[PDB]
Design an enzyme around this catalytic site. Structure first.
Site, PDB file in Angstrom:
ATOM      1  N   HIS A 143     -15.316   7.325  19.037  1.00 51.51           N
ATOM      2  CA  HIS A 143     -16.069   7.539  20.269  1.00 51.51           C
ATOM      3  C   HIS A 143     -17.159   6.499  20.545  1.00 51.51           C
ATOM      4  CE1 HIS A 143     -14.410  11.676  19.528  1.00 51.51           C
ATOM      5  NE2 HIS A 143     -14.081  11.489  20.793  1.00 51.51           N
ATOM      6  N   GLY A 202      -7.696   3.810   6.745  1.00 50.38           N
ATOM      7  CA  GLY A 202      -6.880   4.046   7.925  1.00 50.38           C
ATOM      8  C   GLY A 202      -5.616   3.217   8.003  1.00 50.38           C
ATOM      9  N   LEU A 235     -11.055   9.801  10.775  1.00 49.86           N
ATOM     10  CA  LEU A 235     -11.570   8.447  10.923  1.00 49.86           C
ATOM     11  C   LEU A 235     -11.085   7.736  12.182  1.00 49.86           C
ATOM     12  CD1 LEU A 235      -8.832   7.057   9.619  1.00 49.86           C
ATOM     13  CD2 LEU A 235     -10.243   6.932   7.574  1.00 49.86           C
ATOM     14  N   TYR A 236     -10.133   8.299  12.918  1.00 52.01           N
ATOM     15  CA  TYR A 236      -9.794   7.782  14.237  1.00 52.01           C
ATOM     16  C   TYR A 236     -10.738   8.292  15.324  1.00 52.01           C
ATOM     17  CZ  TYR A 236      -5.815   4.791  15.557  1.00 52.01           C
ATOM     18  OH  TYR A 236      -4.988   3.733  15.853  1.00 52.01           O
ATOM     19  N   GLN A 241      -7.026   6.084  22.651  1.00 53.67           N
ATOM     20  CA  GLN A 241      -7.107   7.515  22.922  1.00 53.67           C
ATOM     21  C   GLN A 241      -5.740   8.072  23.306  1.00 53.67           C
ATOM     22  OE1 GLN A 241      -9.490   8.755  26.248  1.00 53.67           O
ATOM     23  NE2 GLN A 241      -9.683  10.858  25.498  1.00 53.67           N
ATOM     24  N   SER A 270      -1.867   4.393   9.192  1.00 56.27           N
ATOM     25  CA  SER A 270      -1.430   3.802  10.450  1.00 56.27           C
ATOM     26  C   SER A 270      -0.020   3.249  10.330  1.00 56.27           C
ATOM     27  CB  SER A 270      -2.407   2.703  10.870  1.00 56.27           C
ATOM     28  OG  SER A 270      -1.964   2.036  12.037  1.00 56.27           O
ATOM     29  N   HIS A 320      -3.438  10.474  20.722  1.00 51.63           N
ATOM     30  CA  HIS A 320      -3.445  11.865  21.141  1.00 51.63           C
ATOM     31  C   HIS A 320      -2.050  12.454  21.262  1.00 51.63           C
ATOM     32  CE1 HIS A 320      -7.658  11.618  21.379  1.00 51.63           C
ATOM     33  NE2 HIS A 320      -7.845  12.559  22.289  1.00 51.63           N
ATOM     34  N   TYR A 380      -7.074 -10.881  12.446  1.00 49.63           N
ATOM     35  CA  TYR A 380      -6.396 -11.835  11.581  1.00 49.63           C
ATOM     36  C   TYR A 380      -5.841 -13.004  12.389  1.00 49.63           C
ATOM     37  CZ  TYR A 380      -6.368  -7.966   8.184  1.00 49.63           C
ATOM     38  OH  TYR A 380      -6.720  -6.935   7.344  1.00 49.63           O
ATOM     39  N   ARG A 386       0.784  -1.201   0.000  1.00 47.30           N
ATOM     40  CA  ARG A 386       0.000   0.000   0.000  1.00 47.30           C
ATOM     41  C   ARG A 386       0.822   1.260   0.000  1.00 47.30           C
ATOM     42  NH1 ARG A 386      -2.505  -1.917   2.127  1.00 47.30           N
ATOM     43  NH2 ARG A 386      -3.702  -2.406   3.974  1.00 47.30           N
TER      44      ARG A 386
END
Ligand SMILES: COc1ccc2c(c1)c(CC(=O)NCCNS(=O)(=O)c1cccc3c(N(C)C)cccc13)c(C)n2C(=O)c1ccc(Cl)cc1
Ligand SMILES: COc1ccc2c(c1)c(CC(=O)NCCNS(=O)(=O)c1cccc3c(N(C)C)cccc13)c(C)n2C(=O)c1ccc(Cl)cc1
Ligand code: HEM
Ligand code: HEM
Ligand SMILES: *[C@@H]1O[C@H](CO)[C@@H](O[C@@H]2O[C@H](CO)[C@@H](O)[C@H](O)[C@H]2NC(C)=O)[C@H](O)[C@H]1NC(C)=O
Ligand SMILES: *[C@@H]1O[C@H](CO)[C@@H](O[C@@H]2O[C@H](CO)[C@@H](O)[C@H](O)[C@H]2NC(C)=O)[C@H](O)[C@H]1NC(C)=O
Ligand SMILES: CCCCCCCCO[C@@H]1O[C@H](CO)[C@@H](O)[C@H](O)[C@H]1O
Ligand SMILES: CCCCCCCCO[C@@H]1O[C@H](CO)[C@@H](O)[C@H](O)[C@H]1O
Ligand SMILES: *[C@@H]1O[C@H](CO)[C@@H](O)[C@H](O)[C@H]1NC(C)=O
Ligand SMILES: *[C@@H]1O[C@H](CO)[C@@H](O)[C@H](O)[C@H]1NC(C)=O
Ligand SMILES: *[C@@H]1O[C@H](CO)[C@@H](O)[C@H](O)[C@H]1NC(C)=O
Ligand SMILES: *[C@@H]1O[C@H](CO)[C@@H](O)[C@H](O)[C@H]1NC(C)=O
Lengths: 552, 552
Positions: free
Chosen positions: B357, B495, B353-354, B172, B499, B176, B324, B89
């Protein structure tokens, strides 16, 4: 007392202390093993035995002019050779960068703090018994001593490659966008946070400064017209801070991206040519894009000028420096199938060996006048009186000084040469021969081997005793040049990797940037791919005077 | 009126205006040609025809558990597959980065200004007739409408993959450090100038903050002992600025690297564990290196914790998310023979997209108590009352909410979900289907295909009319999940590239960093290469309580 003070690990293995009086060499991926990483692996023995020396290669690149003439005219062959030029030494530059003046080990502070110059070799640890580590005396020889005996010019020594003042001032102008030492922090710190060819010396380092230089019409930079000629704006008009002595009249305080470029009219010449070039490209882009706004015209022009700069530096500037018959080429596609990091961090040692002040003549000859340094420095009225055309014609004719070979630093800038010595020491530079080993060169075994003569060598031997204590900066300036060349081996071999890394590492050379629409279409792309020092002057200097980087 | 408003160029071709009412697509290296870059080249027809769909690949990766068990136990096979995971990717992420909220074309400002989040897709130009370009109505549907009909939780929907509160608070806390929106500038701006896993949420973004957090003995961070337990220091002791409501007593204003981590005891729990881990590694490094100083202990520990973080994120955290049977692997050497850029710029859409919540429960269940949001927020006395062991045991047992599948945003944070909608629009996000196309996914052809059900789909169809006008952020949270999974296809496929790029792009994964001496030798290197969420808790939480990222 640091057990790594003697630089015991060879072949780019890393030394780490393992207790108070013991060390360990990390030979990972060096091609060598053993306590000091000196035992070659089998594949390493072979390639070492098959690798020609740099002086052997330099001979082949500067001779067989007929064979090279054929290579240049076969695009596939030239591309293949240039591709090797770009990748052959990538192993020599740590990218991402590693050490800096304050860190002899890798740390997040060293990686992340962009205010440092990076370091190709870690500093000598503060607690080492001698400045070079363990060799030599408690103190290095008196720097004034070194300066006067082997560095200062007696009689002007011309460059045998024929470099002229267009080249000398181009080198000064171009390099002063990424050599911008932050003297408020120290010699190991820079203000060029872009760490490369971002043209901050034209557009300003910060957004605030950039916006004060911009016209905000048609993407253009602000300018004034004097005697029918376009020059940069003033400090008064722009509120852009510039360094000028208190006596400079306001109408002569020209404002440009780099705050020191009022120091010499040779720099203001190039600042004026590139300002004109930016606004010329703005006109071209506006004709192609009547629908574009001021912001996009400025940004696209800036990207094209970055490309022109890299094109000129590789195919004209480095081409001249090399004296090769093979024609170097700016072609980002050559790296698209290669491992290559599109990033750069400016190394302190790159700054140090770019200290080419022997280039400077004893007087600056414009038309029929011969200005001394005192008359020349900070005197933009010279530029206005003679104009750009006469500047180009004169600087194209005036020969620059030889850099290697010793005793050619003009005494006018002797304080800068002494600071290069003193601050290299302050930054705890390793020895010349450590730097030679770091770039796959043989250590010099005597001072006479370094100079190729007897008198400077003897003076240096009385000062340093041991060749392994010789310092990098003076050695570059006293080194035996290649036959009729401007530089010695150390300069070329240490400087070339940093140079190409700083050029090809730029983001516009990455695949997602290197396409026509980045530059406003094929018309903008073509401005990059046809740029030259000759056309830069021709489009922007009245009368289109001939120029080049060599005399005649 | 911009001719590129309709996003006419397909397959990652770039649109450029060529006049007021005309455009040109730059299809360079897209594999396609033609006016809109839709005519595939021959090699492209082949690979397109041989490429399985992401849902087909997901099926194979989550089934054949017996076959994957064999692959996992063959180091060479596992390495080869993990290598493909990392590079397959590579091409989806612009590196070096391109667009941002203010630039729909490449520019030096967009490349160089690190205060921006970068953008995977350029913004919709300001003068486009509709928010998505040309499709849809003058205005997008009322965001309150969208929020209430399809996003807000009615009944808690548990994650079928079994994610617990250790996982949610790890997500989170971890994210952050690089999602730190600078609201003083706008939603397209970040305060994490490192743009990745630099552990500034532990050590501070700036040197000034880091030095207030440090003990300057043995490399350690400052700490306090409360009831025999090690906790972060206070604001009063350190002068470290933290965000706390005015009523919080001084002794409960814990000071940690990230100024918002007093927001929830779940963050302070992990802030404390990582504080303990840093000082634990300092003790280990001091034992190996009695000759080292405080600065080298701090810097080397920080590099090791960076390595631990990446290790845990890949092999525990992503491993759990993926479901997986293949065992993902943190191994920088897998990229050493591959083209890969060791850099990262945090994308706005990656932030968007992270926004997980729905993970949050309706109440936080620690021991026998069930705290509401109001009781839980900004209340470190809860952490002191129960202690870290009970926090770990309780959060390991409490199930997290499902993220995709619709209607699972807790009403306590409805203002945040509405802000995600509104600020995606302020930042001129392109449509869901544009983002799907940008990451090689098929556009959804109806709302029912997006949700996989009928009621929410009809809700959205009444609001948006056209599927090509559906927005990225609501679509992720209403999307049909993979079978018994936490996410839908869009979440994973968009994502996952960001990532892995943010993890492997870190400099410690580069060849010159990824060696034992960077980390103080083999002992420090082993800390990285054996790290896990279980050992992080086991070494730093009294009693070594069992933990994991899934319940039971
Ligand atoms: C001469 O003077 C100079 C002076 C400066 C030069 C260069 C040459 C060069 C060219 C180069 O780098 N020249 C070595 C190629 N060696 S090579 O690629 O390893 C190689 C090895 C073996 C065989 C090869 C070969 N064949 C087929 C025999 C062909 C071509 C290369 C071969 C560059 C970039 N400079 C800088 O910009 C520069 C800028 C500032 C500083 Cl202070 C220093 C330098
Ligand atoms: C599942 O749920 C998830 C959810 C999140 C995930 C992942 C998986 C993945 C794993 C991945 O990246 N999964 C693509 C594999 N496939 S390829 O595209 O790699 C490929 C293509 C074709 C054949 C293949 C193949 N064979 C054997 C047929 C084997 C392996 C790969 C193959 C990572 C990284 N995520 C993130 O960190 C993450 C973090 C935050 C966000 Cl908001 C989103 C993502
Ligand atoms: C033309 C007249 C020149 C004068 C009067 C001059 C003078 C100086 C001075 C005073 C410094 C010290 C800067 C400072 O400490 O703030 C300096 C630094 C430097 N010089 Fe020159 N120089 C000239 C030309 C050149 C040329 C032709 C080159 C060729 C490359 C060059 C290369 C450098 C470099 C790389 C630095 C380091 C700048 C930095 O680190 O910020 N200079 N020069
Ligand atoms: C546990 C209680 C949580 C609360 C009270 C909470 C609350 C909030 C709030 C109020 C914001 C908006 C902050 C702002 O605009 O400055 C926010 C942003 C965010 N939250 Fe949460 N959140 C929690 C948990 C999580 C979790 C589990 C994740 C999962 C990864 C997460 C991801 C985010 C992200 C990515 C942002 C955007 C951050 C930024 O741009 O600065 N949050 N959260
Ligand atoms: C990069 O490193 C330099 C050197 O440590 C930092 O400069 C110091 O900053 C402190 C305040 O944080 C001052 O008290 C010192 O006087 C500075 N020293 C020097 C030599 O300038 C600088 O702050 C760092 N920059 C970043 C962005 O972290
Ligand atoms: C990065 O870009 C932002 C946005 O243009 C710059 O922030 C602006 O800075 C000017 C002063 O130069 C202020 O008047 C504006 O209010 C700022 N706008 C915003 C939205 O913050 C910022 O200066 C740029 N950063 C760098 C390093 O150039
Ligand atoms: C076709 C192959 C011809 C190879 C020519 C090799 C010539 C080597 O050239 C010599 O190398 C020495 C090495 O230090 C230098 O000292 C000399 O100045 C240099 O001319
Ligand atoms: C122009 C600056 C010269 C400084 C003179 C101080 C002493 C210099 O030193 C001597 O200079 C002699 C004459 O060039 C050389 O022959 C000697 O080798 C050198 O030691
Ligand atoms: C390694 O270097 C040290 C000094 O730097 C020397 O004493 C030692 O004998 C060397 N070891 C080997 C195996 O060459
Ligand atoms: C500046 O240059 C002018 C010539 O243009 C000359 O007349 C004047 O003397 C110079 N100024 C100084 C201080 O040397
Ligand atoms: C390209 O797209 C435009 C609209 O986006 C369309 O009108 C045109 O017909 C397309 N051209 C081709 C060759 O498909
Ligand atoms: C904070 O938590 C404590 C329990 O540790 C509780 O008694 C108190 O009511 C909480 N404070 C608020 C404002 O909810």
């Amino acid at each position: 007392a640091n057990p790594c003070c003697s630089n015991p690990c060879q072949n780019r293995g890393e030394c780490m202390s393992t207790g108070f009086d013991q060390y360990k060499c990390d030979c990972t991926r060096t091609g060598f093993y053993g306590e000091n990483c000196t035992t070659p692996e089998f594949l390493t023995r072979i390639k070492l035995l098959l690798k020609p020396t740099p002086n052997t290669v330099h001979y082949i690149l500067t001779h067989f002019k007929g064979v090279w003439n054929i290579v240049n005219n076969i695009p596939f062959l030239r591309s293949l050779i240039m591709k090797y030029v770009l990748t052959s030494r990538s192993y020599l530059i740590d990218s991402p960068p590693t050490y800096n003046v304050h860190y002899g080990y890798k740390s997040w502070e060293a990686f992340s703090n962009l205010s440092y110059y990076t370091r190709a070799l870690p500093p000598v640890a503060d607690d080492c018994p001698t400045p070079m580590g363990v060799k030599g005396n408690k103190e290095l020889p008196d720097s004034k001593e070194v300066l006067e005996k082997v560095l200062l010019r007696r009689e002007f020594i011309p460059d045998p490659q024929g470099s002229n003042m267009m080249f000398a001032f181009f080198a000064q102008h171009f390099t002063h966008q990424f050599f911008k030492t932050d003297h408020k922090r120290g010699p190991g710190f820079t203000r060029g946070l872009g760490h490369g060819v971002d043209l901050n010396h034209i557009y300003g380092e910060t957004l605030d400064r950039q916006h004060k230089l911009r016209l905000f019409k048609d993407g253009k930079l602000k300018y004034q017209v004097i005697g029918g000629e376009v020059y940069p704006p003033t400090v008064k008009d722009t509120q852009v801070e510039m360094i000028y002595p208190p006596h400079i009249p306001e109408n002569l305080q020209f404002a440009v991206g780099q705050e020191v470029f009022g120091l010499v009219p040779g720099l203001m010449m190039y600042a004026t040519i590139w300002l004109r070039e930016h606004n010329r490209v703005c006109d071209i882009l506006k004709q192609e894009h009547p629908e574009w706004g001021d912001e996009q015209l400025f940004q696209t022009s800036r990207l094209i000028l970055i490309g022109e700069t890299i094109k000129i530096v590789i195919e004209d500037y480095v081409q001249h420096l090399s004296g090769y018959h093979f024609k170097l080429k700016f072609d980002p596609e050559l790296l698209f199938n290669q491992q290559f990091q599109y990033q750069n961090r400016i190394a302190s040692e790159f700054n140090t060996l770019y200290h080419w002040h022997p280039l400077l003549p004893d007087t600056f000859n414009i038309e029929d006048q011969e200005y001394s340094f005192k008359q020349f420095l900070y005197n933009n009225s010279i530029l206005l009186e003679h104009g750009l055309t006469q500047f180009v014609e004169s600087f194209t004719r005036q020969i620059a000084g030889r850099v290697a070979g010793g005793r050619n630093v003009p005494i006018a800038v002797q304080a800068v040469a002494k600071a290069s010595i003193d601050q290299s020491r302050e930054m705890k530079y390793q020895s010349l021969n450590e730097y030679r080993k770091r770039f796959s060169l043989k250590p010099y075994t005597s001072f006479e081997e370094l100079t190729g003569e007897k008198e400077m060598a003897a003076e240096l031997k009385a000062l340093y005793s041991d060749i392994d204590v010789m310092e990098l900066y003076p050695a570059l300036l006293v080194e035996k040049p290649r036959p009729d060349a401007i530089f010695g081996e150390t300069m070329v071999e240490l400087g070339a990797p940093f140079s190409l890394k700083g050029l090809m590492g730029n983001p516009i050379c990455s695949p997602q940037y290197w396409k026509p629409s980045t530059f406003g279409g094929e018309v903008g792309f073509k401005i990059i791919n046809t740029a030259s020092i000759q056309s830069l002057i021709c489009n922007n200097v009245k009368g289109c005077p001939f120029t080049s980087f060599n005399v005649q």
